[PDB]
């Protein structure tokens, strides 16, 4: 950030210095591949190559989500953060309540990270507890009835969009406190950078030696936290 100062008339200007820093994202490669022997073409009622191409693309897509989650969850969060740390809302002795939503929203507002697109990533257990909050489900607090709809998935609250992450074999959202404390994250869009060298590449080829079709898909990406001031973590008890 720059700063404005005063000076005498005809005096030389004395700038207020602006700091700089850098963020580094490390690129990784992942592969999702399968084989389909030609002897199964006439023996199946389904199209094995077509199904495999669909399943491989989902495996790649699930890994892409895992890379984003690992970067966000891997940042440093403190209850009294400095400019290089994200804000933390401690677990205390409660679950995901309306109080913790207000505190998380406070940190984003305080650090000028409340403009643009803001996303709240939560897992299934966090949604289950948030469905008991009156301020999210009562129609006199919000102009929607999520209990008549898809729940918290896609819901907008205080200008932030909720995304519910399912349980993935890739890992999903991590826990803490010996598997008794869940972690949820409030992310400003500009706070995290995601380098996408290859979102979804691939090649389906006939291998004469193995007399099979090789459905091979791959991805190449990495993520890094750019500005921790746009990151907030909320901790809650899995069994309040």
């Amino acid at each position: 950030e720059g700063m404005a100062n005063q000076k005498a008339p005809q005096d030389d200007i004395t700038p207020m210095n602006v700091s700089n820093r850098d963020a580094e994202a490390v690129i990784e490669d992942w592969y999702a591949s399968e084989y389909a022997d030609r002897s199964f073409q006439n023996k199946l009622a389904v199209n094995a190559v077509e199904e495999y191409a669909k399943l491989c693309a989902w495996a790649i897509g699930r890994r892409a989500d895992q890379i984003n989650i690992d970067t966000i969850a891997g940042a440093t969060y403190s209850a009294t953060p400095n400019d290089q740390q994200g804000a933390l809302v401690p677990v205390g002795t409660t679950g995901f309540t309306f109080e913790k939503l207000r505190q998380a929203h406070r940190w984003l507002r305080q650090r000028s990270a409340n403009r643009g697109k803001r996303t709240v990533i939560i897992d299934a257990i966090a949604e289950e507890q948030l469905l008991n909050v009156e301020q999210l489900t009562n129609s006199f607090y919000v102009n929607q009835k999520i209990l008549d709809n898809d729940g918290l998935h896609g819901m907008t609250f205080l200008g932030m969009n909720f995304i519910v992450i399912p349980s993935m074999q890739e890992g999903g959202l991590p826990t803490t406190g010996g598997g008794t404390v869940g972690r949820a994250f409030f992310i400003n869009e500009m706070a995290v950078g995601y380098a996408q060298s290859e979102r979804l590449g691939g090649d389906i080829s006939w291998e004469n030696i193995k007399t099979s079709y090789l459905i091979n898909m791959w991805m190449e990406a990495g993520a890094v936290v750019i500005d921790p001031k746009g990151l907030v973590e909320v901790d809650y008890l899995l069994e309040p």
Binding site: A4, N5, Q6, K7, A8, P9, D12, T14, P15, M16
Partner: protein, 89 residues
């Protein structure tokens, strides 16, 4: 009190990794105060933008040529937060 119109800059370099040299006119044609008054703690607080956070044009180690109404002396800035304090060069 401090008067910004009597504060000038001597060093011509804009390099911010080194120090700066200032000159202050506290003589009868300026603020008209003694060197002791100008060198007192917190006198140059008005020159800073946010002295509580140490934000301003003065830096630690900066050399100030103080021309009081009774004498003159070189001084050096030691702290910019929570107050601006100088000491004899």
């Amino acid at each position: 009190a401090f008067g910004i119109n009597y504060m000038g800059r001597v060093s011509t370099s804009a390099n911010n990794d080194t120090q700066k040299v200032w000159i202050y006119n506290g003589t009868a044609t300026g603020s008209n105060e003694t060197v002791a008054t100008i060198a007192a703690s917190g006198y140059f607080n008005a020159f800073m933008v946010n002295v509580a956070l140490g934000k301003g044009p003065l830096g630690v180690g900066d050399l100030i040529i103080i021309n009081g109404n009774d004498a003159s002396a070189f001084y050096t800035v030691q702290t910019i937060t929570p107050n601006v304090t100088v000491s004899v060069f």
